Symmetry: C2
Subunit: 149 residues, 2 copies
């Protein structure tokens, strides 16, 4: 499971925050986009896969699963595109709790930037560095390193 990621789309301020979660570590990357389209999702995945060894992505909905733009990007980047059906029901709850936590952090920083995109990157930073004791940023690196070796 070092290579498995989950996509997650949440809304704030009339915009969309697209999140990718590294399932085993809870590490995240995120971006603000005007709306979820296949093209936005495809580009986001392309970025993610150039930065981390992304083997599998559990897509966030059926439209992204279906999208030929998303499929083409997964093909290009060597990603196995899978559904995100919560066969383990605890997955829904974990995602919902992460979205709530992220929005809480965005609120706490919202004053330290004019633009939502900046606040979201601040939120990513705080989420990934938070010791819960190791941080998510530490866990993902350790997981992948162990896999390499």
């Amino acid at each position: 499971s070092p290579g498995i990621w989950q996509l997650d789309c949440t809304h704030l301020e009339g915009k969309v925050i697209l999140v990718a979660v590294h399932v085993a570590s809870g590490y995240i990357e995120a971006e603000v986009i005007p709306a979820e389209t296949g093209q936005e999702t495809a580009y986001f995945l392309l970025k993610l896969a150039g930065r981390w060894p992304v083997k599998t992505v559990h897509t966030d909905n059926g439209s992204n699963f279906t999208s030929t733009t998303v499929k083409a990007a997964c093909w290009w980047a060597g990603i196995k595109q899978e559904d995100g059906i919560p066969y383990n029901p605890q997955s829904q709850g974990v995602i919902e709790s992460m979205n709530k936590e992220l929005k809480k952090i965005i609120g706490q920083v919202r004053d330290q930037a004019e633009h939502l995109k900046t606040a979201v990157q601040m939120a990513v930073f705080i989420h990934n560095h938070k010791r819960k004791g190791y941080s998510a940023g530490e866990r993902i690196v350790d997981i992948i390193a162990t896999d390499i070796q």
Copy 2:
């Protein structure tokens, strides 16, 4: 040196490609921007530091070094902003060759996307995954993991 990064700005197609290189591994992140400004650089560093444990950034030029916008982002993210003076002359050459390699890869993929930004992300992917043997992506993770066990 697990935490040291170097900024690098190169130009293509009338646009600017801002690159951050993890010095010890050669791993990179990059984005296309219309022009280098303090604000663009500040935002790029904010992104980078939320994703990797960035201790020190050797800035690419004196304007970004001076920039109060860049300084504010570095303060926020806990980054030590340093100059990028190549006291070791090997550094100019390493960056130049990287820019040349990246532009080559962009040309090789240029036909697989309408937009330069897409091609640049494809170039990042190819650069980071290229086995030279380990890839830069493998080296950065090994370097940081080794550091964390300290």
